[PDB]
Amino acid sequence: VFSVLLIFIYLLLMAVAVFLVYRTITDFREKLKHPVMSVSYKEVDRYDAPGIALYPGQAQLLSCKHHYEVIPPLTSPGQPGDMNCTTQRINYTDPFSNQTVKSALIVQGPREVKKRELVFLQFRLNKSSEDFSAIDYLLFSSFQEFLQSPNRVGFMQACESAYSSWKFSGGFRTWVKMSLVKTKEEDGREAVEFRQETSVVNYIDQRPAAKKSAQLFFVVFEWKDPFIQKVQDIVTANPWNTIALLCGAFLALFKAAEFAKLSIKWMI
Amino acid sequence: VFSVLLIFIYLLLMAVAVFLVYRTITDFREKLKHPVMSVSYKEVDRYDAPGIALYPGQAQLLSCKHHYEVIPPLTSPGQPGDMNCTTQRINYTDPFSNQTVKSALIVQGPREVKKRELVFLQFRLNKSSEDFSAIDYLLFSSFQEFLQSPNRVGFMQACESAYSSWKFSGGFRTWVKMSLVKTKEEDGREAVEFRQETSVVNYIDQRPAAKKSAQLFFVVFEWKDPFIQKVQDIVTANPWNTIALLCGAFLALFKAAEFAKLSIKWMI
Amino acid sequence: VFSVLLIFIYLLLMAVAVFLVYRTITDFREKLKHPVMSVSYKEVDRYDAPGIALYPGQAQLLSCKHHYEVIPPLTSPGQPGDMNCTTQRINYTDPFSNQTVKSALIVQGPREVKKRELVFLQFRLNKSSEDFSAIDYLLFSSFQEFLQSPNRVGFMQACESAYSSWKFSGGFRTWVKMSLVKTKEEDGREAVEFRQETSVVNYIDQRPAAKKSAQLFFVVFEWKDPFIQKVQDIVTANPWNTIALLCGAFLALFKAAEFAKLSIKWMI
Ligand SMILES: C[C@H](CCC(=O)O)[C@H]1CC[C@H]2[C@@H]3CC[C@@H]4C[C@H](O)CC[C@]4(C)[C@H]3C[C@H](O)[C@]12C
Ligand SMILES: C[C@H](CCC(=O)O)[C@H]1CC[C@H]2[C@@H]3CC[C@@H]4C[C@H](O)CC[C@]4(C)[C@H]3C[C@H](O)[C@]12C
Ligand SMILES: C[C@H](CCC(=O)O)[C@H]1CC[C@H]2[C@@H]3CC[C@@H]4C[C@H](O)CC[C@]4(C)[C@H]3C[C@H](O)[C@]12C
Numbered sequence: 001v002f003s004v005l006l007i008f009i010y011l012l013l014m015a016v017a018v019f020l021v022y023r024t025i026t027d028f029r030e031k032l033k034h035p036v037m038s039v040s041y042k043e044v045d046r047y048d049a050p051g052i053a054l055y056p057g058q059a060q061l062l063s064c065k066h067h068y069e070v071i072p073p074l075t076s077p078g079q080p081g082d083m084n085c086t087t088q089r090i091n092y093t094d095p096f097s098n099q100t101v102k103s104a105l106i107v108q109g110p111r112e113v114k115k116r117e118l119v120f121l122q123f124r125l126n127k128s129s130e131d132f133s134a135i136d137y138l139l140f141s142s143f144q145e146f147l148q149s150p151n152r153v154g155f156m157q158a159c160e161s162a163y164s165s166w167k168f169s170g171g172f173r174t175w176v177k178m179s180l181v182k183t184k185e186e187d188g189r190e191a192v193e194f195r196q197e198t199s200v201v202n203y204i205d206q207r208p209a210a211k212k213s214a215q216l217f218f219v220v221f222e223w224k225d226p227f228i229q230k231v232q233d234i235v236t237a238n239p240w241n242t243i244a245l246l247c248g249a250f251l252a253l254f255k256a257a258e259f260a261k262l263s264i265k266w267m268i
Numbered sequence: 269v270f271s272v273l274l275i276f277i278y279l280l281l282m283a284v285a286v287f288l289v290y291r292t293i294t295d296f297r298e299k300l301k302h303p304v305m306s307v308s309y310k311e312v313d314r315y316d317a318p319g320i321a322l323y324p325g326q327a328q329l330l331s332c333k334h335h336y337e338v339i340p341p342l343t344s345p346g347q348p349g350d351m352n353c354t355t356q357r358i359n360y361t362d363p364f365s366n367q368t369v370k371s372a373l374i375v376q377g378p379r380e381v382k383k384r385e386l387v388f389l390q391f392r393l394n395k396s397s398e399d400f401s402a403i404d405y406l407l408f409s410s411f412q413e414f415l416q417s418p419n420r421v422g423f424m425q426a427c428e429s430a431y432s433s434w435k436f437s438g439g440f441r442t443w444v445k446m447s448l449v450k451t452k453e454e455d456g457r458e459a460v461e462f463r464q465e466t467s468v469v470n471y472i473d474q475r476p477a478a479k480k481s482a483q484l485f486f487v488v489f490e491w492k493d494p495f496i497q498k499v500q501d502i503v504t505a506n507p508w509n510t511i512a513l514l515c516g517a518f519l520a521l522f523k524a525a526e527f528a529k530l531s532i533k534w535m536i
Numbered sequence: 537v538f539s540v541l542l543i544f545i546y547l548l549l550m551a552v553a554v555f556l557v558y559r560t561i562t563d564f565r566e567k568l569k570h571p572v573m574s575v576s577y578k579e580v581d582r583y584d585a586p587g588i589a590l591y592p593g594q595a596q597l598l599s600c601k602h603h604y605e606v607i608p609p610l611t612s613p614g615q616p617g618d619m620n621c622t623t624q625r626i627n628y629t630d631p632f633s634n635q636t637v638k639s640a641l642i643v644q645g646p647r648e649v650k651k652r653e654l655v656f657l658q659f660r661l662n663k664s665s666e667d668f669s670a671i672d673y674l675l676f677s678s679f680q681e682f683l684q685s686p687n688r689v690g691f692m693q694a695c696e697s698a699y700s701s702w703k704f705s706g707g708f709r710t711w712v713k714m715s716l717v718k719t720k721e722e723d724g725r726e727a728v729e730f731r732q733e734t735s736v737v738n739y740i741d742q743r744p745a746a747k748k749s750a751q752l753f754f755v756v757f758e759w760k761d762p763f764i765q766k767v768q769d770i771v772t773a774n775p776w777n778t779i780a781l782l783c784g785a786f787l788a789l790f791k792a793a794e795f796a797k798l799s800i801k802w803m804i
Contacts, residue, residue, distance in 0.1 A: 023508045034306045034502055038570045073666055130341055132441045132486070134469040164493070167443065169469040173668045175703065200468065200736065201670040201705040204751065215472065218668070225700070234570055236504065236772065240559045241781060245509060248516025248784025251791060255519060291776045302574045302770055398609055400709045400754070402737040432761070435711065437737040468736065483740070504772065513777060516784025523787055 006264045013257045020249050024242055031237035035186070042228040050109035050178065050194070051143035052119070052221055053159070055102060055136040059125040059217060061087070064107060069116035071220065078124055078207060078216055085119060088146070092156040104156060108143045109178070110222050118222035125170065126214040133215050138165035139178060139194035163193055170217040172200035177224035184232040197224065274532045281525045288517050292510055299505035303454070310496040318377035318446065318462070319411035320387070320489050321427070323370060323404040327393040327485060329355070332375060337384035339488065346392055346475060346484055353387060356414070360424040372424060376411045377446070378490055386490035393438070394482040401483050406433035407446060407462035431461055438483045440468035445492040452500040465492065542800045549793045556785050560778055567773035571722070578764040586645035586714065586730070587679035588655070588757050589695070591638055591672040595659040595753060597623070600643060605652035607756065614660055614743060614752055621655060624682070628692040640692060644679045645714070646758050654758035661706070662750040669751050674701035675714060675730035699729055706751045708736035713760035720768040733760065 054061075062078070064085040075081075086108045094100050110117035125133055140146070140159040149155045168174040177197045182190050203218060322329075330346070332353040354376040362368050378385040393401055408414070408427040417423045436442040445465045450458050471486060590597075598614065600621040611617075622644040630636050646653035661669055676682070676695040685691045704710040713733045718726050739754060 020508060020512065024512075027506060027508070031502075034308070034500055036304045036502055036572045037307045039573045040570070071668075077667065128472065131345065131472045131474070132339075132469050133472060167467050167469060169440075171470050172705075198467070199703050199705075199734070201668050201703060202707050204664065204667045204669060206667070232570055234567075234572055238563060240556060240563070244556065244560075244781045244785040244788075245512045245516070247788035248519070248781070249512040251784070251788045252512075252515035252519050288776060288780065292780075295774060295776070299770075302576065302768055304572045304770055305575045396740065399613065399740050399742070400607075400737050401740060435735050435737060437708075437735075439738050466735070513780045513784070516787070517780040520780075520783035520787045 002264050002268045006261050009260045010257050013253050017250060017253045021246065024246055028237050028242050035233040035235045038232045038234045040230045042230055044226050044228055045114065046111055047113050047223055048142045049111045049144060051140045051146050052107045052109050053138045054105045056105060056123055059123040059135060061121065062124045063122040065120045067118055067120055071120055078211060078214065090152060090156060092153045095157045095160055106143060106146055113223040113226040116222060118220055121219045123217040124214055128215060133170040134167045135217055136165050136167050138163050141192050166196060168219050170215045171203045173203060173218040173220060175199045175201065175220045177222060179224045180228045182228060182230050186233050270532050270536045274529050277528045278525050281521050285518060285521045289514065292514055296505050296510050303501040303503045306500045306502045308498045310498055312494050312496055313382065314379055315381050315491055316410045317379050317412060319408045319414055320375045320377050321406045322373045324373060324391055327391040327403060330392045331390040333388045335386055335388055339388055346479060346482065358420060358424065360421045363425045363428055374411060374414055381491040381494045384490060386488055389487045391485035392482055396483055402435045402437045403485055404433050404435050406431050409460050434464065436487050438485045439471045441471060441486040441488060443467045443469065443488045445490060447492045448496045450496060450498050454501050538800050538804045542797050545796045546793050549789050553786060553789045557782065560782055564773050564778050571769040571771045574768045574770045576766045578766055580762050580764055581650065582647055583649050583759055585647045585679045587676045587682050588643045588645050589674045590641045592641060592659055595661045595671055598660045599658040601656045603654055603656055607656055614747060614750065626688060626692065628689045631693045631696055642679060642682055649759040649762040652758065654756055657755045659753035660750055664751055669706045670703045671753055672701050672703050674699050677728050702732060704755050706753045707739045709739060709754040709756060711735045711756045713758060715760045716764045718764060718766050722769050
């Protein structure tokens, strides 16, 4: 009969509404669990002076110069001179071991990026008792923060775990091109880290055989490109959009049921 | 006349509805073609023992030791000893050529990551007849899987193409920091691959000139950080959301047409 | 009284509607500012011949050969021969300095990818007056474009800034595995760049002591895998979806107000 058919149609519409609700709930849960990633690139005319933390240990810093896009030939490799840069020593306890004390050297990085400003560091090591010579190094956002901070040690304990300390080797003029990655944690705070592309270049040993005992390290720190990579974890599980969608679907289903009832009545 | 104006308004609303339908269809097709990417990081207290597959060939494995965050100095480089690790040889046919037989060596990787556990491998090569000496290597998820698999050869034919085999050279204590990337294929299966950051460090030749003929290889395998990168291809082209949006728009347009008709009648 | 309660309910519904409108506006602005990223991998049976631009300078190109997945042993390192490849010299003004003139050499890269085709380049440098010997190099999409372009110099000024020029060092058979990243700029144009993974391998000096003065360079260019990474900045801030959502919410709110008024009248 017409009434039974209308009742069945209304029940089917109610079942469809319940299924739509279930699908929206499960999809909202899924989208909440899995935020999408948005990568943007910010133009910068001048980078904040990035702090470069080396750990020479027993290797003195022979030279620390600044240059623009090209390194001039060495007047006399292995001889100290031309410390035309700002440097600050420090000694800090390891955050993890808490016993070993690490002696770090903080150097101002290159500020100009459009001009390809770079910092050239020549170390030296004499009669090293340990094989596999290398110097660790790390990067943090601003040397000015290290300058003006109330306590400088705690800054280093924070940066040691905030960033990851790489290593560079002796006999290679390791060219380090840096870039900044700022990740939004969706908690009102952005974590800034350094992505460094290292290209090692061999060194020619033209020194006298006697001087071959000492092992020379060379490194260069510059800025890859004036792009800062902002990575934001966008969340598409917006409750208001889901509520609006569900209300629209419910109203459409109710009016479809009313249309079906009107059509059934008209047919009768 | 009022009737003509109402008819034109209703026709305009119908055209708007058709345009909305077309836009929704094309946007749904586009979103279906281009899924978005969601990157998440999973904390892990202990990594599954990762399998390191080397291909020494003619270079014997002088030493295979385990260490925690620091490599002790070599008592006597170039002298075998201290094989304090699990190793399994194997010979398998190349999946591509099917003729050349590769002799691989599977080593258990570092399990502890919070403690920075690492495996130190010292090989050696004597009177090498080939220039550009180096050893290939590759990584797969779990050495236990290789242990307990029914057929071990097929596991290697699968891993050779599933992962990409890198190379590490002689005279450099290549430091390999591993990380796991698990990509969801949206087919109920996740593909797990290794992203390895390599930092080479030169080696000091303090051996006698006569011993200089043999070439020594040194490599280290550890875990970068206790973070596993899950990359999921989220799909935003949800048919139910599109249907709900279209139904809501249709109902809104129908009621707008009815409001316009009522207003026209009231004006008359 | 019932009328006052109905008026308050209608006012509350209107306030909810205004809040929904504000939320939709702010969310649309946010989503417009932050597009999501979609990464897809396109299969390719054969890569377009990629153009490899070196800048040898004073380093002669001793050999430029092609090979399939394996480099045969050198018959006589440091001796020219076997230039079985296409090469084109050029001289162009630096886009930035505009004064220094760079002499570039364009070589056809490897076309076959399934067969692991690769190009092997052996240079040579004799009595170098500059320390830290190395040759720059860069990649652009197609060597055929450089062949058939009307002006070839302008192509180089475009590519120098479009891509980033890396460096490869002496004594290392730097193995360069290339991959293509095509980024959609949402402006009808796609920017194509090269991501190159470099694995350096030491070289054995078996040459006579007298020949040790000359420094030999070795490099290999191949294709990592037949996957092209398409990165598209998807935009989820679709105005039509927002309009449909808002219209659905408005209709639902108006009909809820009418339901409330009907219920109030029924109660009275
Ligand atoms: C875990 C989150 C948030 C927990 C909370 O805020 O209570 C999950 C658990 C259950 C989720 C709800 C499921 C269906 C809910 C009814 C609606 O058709 C619109 C989405 C709502 C309103 C969702 C809101 C949010 O997505 C919730 C609540
Ligand atoms: C290729 C896919 C899927 C093929 C299929 O499942 O038939 C495409 C081809 C045509 C696509 C349809 C276009 C408009 C359809 C009508 C609705 O206003 C809601 C989206 C619908 C329901 C879409 C569903 C899905 O997005 C489809 C079907
Ligand atoms: C800056 C953009 C685009 C500028 C423009 O096209 O005018 C911003 C500025 C204000 C934005 C509008 C805010 C609310 C608008 C009313 C609707 O409830 C649906 C979204 C609309 C239509 C939005 C469209 C677009 O998102 C706009 C217009």
